[model samples]
Target chain A: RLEKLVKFMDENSIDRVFIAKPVNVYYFSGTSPLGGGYIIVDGDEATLYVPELEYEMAKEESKLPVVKFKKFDEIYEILKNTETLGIEGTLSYSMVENFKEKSNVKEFKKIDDVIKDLRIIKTKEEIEIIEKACEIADKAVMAAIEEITEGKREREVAAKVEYLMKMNGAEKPAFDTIIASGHRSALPHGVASDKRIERGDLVVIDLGALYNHYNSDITRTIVAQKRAVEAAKPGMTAKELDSIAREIIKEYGYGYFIHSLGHGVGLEIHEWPRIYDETVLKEGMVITIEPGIYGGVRIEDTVLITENGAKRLTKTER
Target chain B: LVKFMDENSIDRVFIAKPVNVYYFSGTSPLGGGYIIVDGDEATLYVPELEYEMAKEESKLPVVKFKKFDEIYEILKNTETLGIEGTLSYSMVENFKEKSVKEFKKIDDVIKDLRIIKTKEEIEIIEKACEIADKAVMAAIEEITEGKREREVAAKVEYLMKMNGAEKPAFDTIIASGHRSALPHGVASDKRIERGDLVVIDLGALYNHYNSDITRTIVVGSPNEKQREIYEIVLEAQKRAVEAAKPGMTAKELDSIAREIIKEYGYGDYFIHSLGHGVGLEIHEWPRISQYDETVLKEGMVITIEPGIYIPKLGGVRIEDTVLITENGAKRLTKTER
Candidate 1:
């Protein structure tokens, strides 16, 4: 990743790049600062500037050399004479002003898209970690299914799912667990509430797990009226799936489908190549094919892009 | 807050921080959202995906954020615009290029206003603190000899959620034995052993308000050295809490605890600052540190946490969220230290 960044800098006529986003720094330096830090990549060397509190951890975790600095002047000294500095687009406005006041750089270019493009393609190690995360999420959803008895509150079911994921080696949930039941399921982003579960109600259970900094997102909707499962076949385009889901839900004559088919799942729960953005299926990418119908039902799965088509990473029966 | 905006000759203020958005408008959009306050009229701009939820929850007029052209049209007649200092560089650049006007940062003004809690804010924080206290009690019961640190943290977080916390205010820290020396050591796979000192630092988030508390205890009976360090930290925390009063400088409150630890010849062991303010975010303004000169005023909610960490031995930190009163501070978190 660092080599790719250096190549991009060379091609863009950039002398040095200042990486301020913690996730981007972690991508290039292999260590994310707890307090605060910055990565200055000049030539072949990537120097990580971190606060004294995270100095030891940075030294132990980073592949590059670490420098412990208390003030921003130390970082300024290194870039004072540099020209055509590459900065992350996500750098705060105040920080940009501070850098402009301290440095004599002639050009400041945004390189956030470059980094995001690099992160879009998952390596084998990244895939394995995401697969493991998906496994944990699958087990958690199964456990939640067993616990979703009559009279259980949505929050209680959410708590059980999160606890199971954490106990099974997930660092944390990729995002907040969503356990919307019955009429509450009409709200697409409805978070778990104190509403109790009842028979003949549609329950939407959307959850994910994070492992080794990789993320997996999956959503499953259960109809308490009768236990039935549905699965999407491979090589199906997002639009085709959306059409099929809309048609199927329309047959119920009670609710309508809203929102996109799915989205890319990776380091960030929501990343590039959104289904609604007209993104075509490609290899080496992982995404969620979630189709939700408000006041009705939603079913989702984490799928991996393969050579021929897509492969389901999550192992839930549905 | 609006008075400050007028005094600064600013007509409109654009807020980007999620917490700030929630503070001004009662809804937290799931995606990119902004709260544009033009005089007394505040409009929330959210993506179409969040429009429905924002309409249901937000107190302000919710509008779909279709394009930057719409925002420009709304602020066309404004003379001076105030933008959050925390806005991203690309976003600031976009606004600066499009608006072609002078801009000022309004974060400090908002911080000054948020430093003093309203009656409603205090009530919400009190509820959050109560939930944290109960969660800690439930967590302590699960601290067995052979359990992993991560398991304990997981259970504690689950209990907090079940008890009405929207989520953990921050990452749960469960350091044990020698690992306890690291002040911010997060939970790991390390297993708890008998006679090991365990430090559990966690918080609960409720109604967008937060409460943070830390407690260190021994798995078994504490040895003489462990007991001495624990008592010293406890005394330091207690003194800091007792010394917290209105009209006192933040530095004075920090020194009240620092001087006691120094008197015991463990000054070097106390590496971090005393405590910080807690509200919308876990760490907020009115920070109680050695360098901060901000004075403690009535209705300011802050934490007085003091700790001593020995590299080879263990560490202990005791903390509580307190509200400044007319005379002294009152504890909101009722968990036993």
Candidate 2:
């Protein structure tokens, strides 16, 4: 992991970088996410610093050397003369400013994009884990849909979906389960509320499963509606792929498709290679293809960008 | 939020934190957005992805997200701009390099407004606490000497949902035996053996309000040293909760727990703080720690978790959510643990 990162550091002349964000920490260190700690990479070596309470766990989980977290001043003393310090945009302004002021740093540069570039492509191992996560999401959402009867509160259905995800080998729900029903479905991000589901109400069940730190996102409009297999290929630009799915919705005389086609999903539910952009699609990249209408109808799938075509990982019949 | 602006006498403020946006805009916890509140007018500026959803959910008007170009244009006309202070350095630098306008950091103001629980918030929190108790107890009843730790956590989460919790407040910790020594150990598939100490720390989320509680139980009867450690932890947490009132400082409240554990000769084993506030996020401000000097105020809901961890042996932690009351603290959790 640090091989590519070190090359980036060499090219950019970044003296060192500290990764404290849990998501990034897990990605860089191969350890379970820590609520409080940081990974410091200086030159060729990277070490994990964790709170005293977490030091033991870090030792067990990481192959890198683990040390107890030092005070801020003690930490600043190590980098008393950094010419250019690298950090993540995920950090808060106050923390970033404090570090610059205390550490005597000349330049504070954001290396967030470079880090995203490293994670943009999935390895075979990552793809295998994502495939399992995708399979669990399909099963859990379908299982929860079967339990949704008339008069059940939208929140209740969401609870069932989350529970089923855990039962189906997910460490946790990838995100808050969305069971937007009836008029509520019109609101794309409508969280399940206390409102009851009525007969003839169109319900949208969007759910995912997080398996072994990998994530999968899937959405289904009740009595299921669509797929984007024909629109996906390795050679197309992300926007080109999006336009294919979007053209069909526009042809149906619907101007209500408010959002882009979909987003790349991996360690994070939303990651690089956004579907609205012009980034080139490549094989071995995993992304979602979701198309929606505002008066409330949508369908989604997590697809593998293959050498020839798209492969659907989510096979559960809605 | 107009009321917050009026009370603070701020002409305009920009908030980008997800929790703060949820507080002022009445939006669900989805993708976040930048919020600009100017006098009586407030707007939530979200990405195109969340425009419709924000418009549907926010109490204020929704604007498609704009970068510093339009952001500076929106705020340059005003006297002073206010930011939540938690915006990324990348955003802060962008705002500064543009020379938009002089701004004030409203970090303290925002925390002050959020720390005190409203009547409606308390009601929601009470329900969340009750659900946590019901869920934890239901799962506790299902525990056995040979069950896997992850299995227990699954049932705990399922019971939480069955009892009206939209979700868990955080990752449930079902640390068993040696794993209990790690304060943040997540549930794994290790089988529980006879006489193992199991630290079951869980919480529930209801209406975006949260409650956290923890209990350390044994598979059967506890051994001599484990029994002594458990008593000390319970005593420390009890004293902190009982002594907590409106006039006390958080540091003093934490010292109460620290002193109790110190007297028991395990002060060094107590690696973490006594507790912290519990609200929209599982962990919030007004931390009850050695460094935090915030004065305890009525209407604030916080946790009192005291524990002792001896590596290679085991650990025991007892936690409960409480409200800083006029007289003392009122316990929100009702489980006998």
Shares of reference contacts reproduced by the candidates, in order, are 0.61, 0.69
Interface RMSD of each: 1.7, 2.3
* lDDT of prediction 2: 0.82
Report the lDDT of model 1 for residue B298: 93
On the 0 to 100 scale, the lDDT of residue A106 in model 1 is: 75
Candidate 2 chain A lDDT trough over 10 residues, lowest sum:
A223-232
lDDT of 1 by residue, A1-318 (tens): 888888888898889899987778888888887667799988777889986556665777899899987555788888886788889988887777767778777778888767877887788888999999999999988887888879999998998889999898888999988888888887777788899999988888889998878899877788611111133344445455455555655677733555666777887898866664544445677877776656656778887877766678888876
Q: Give the TM-score of candidate 2.
A: 0.92
Per-residue CA lDDT of candidate 2, range B38-80, in tens? Answer: 7878788776666676777888788885343677667665656
Model 1 alpha-carbon drift over 4 Å, by segment:
A71-82, A102-106, A224-257, A276-282, B29-33, B47-58, B64-79, B97-100
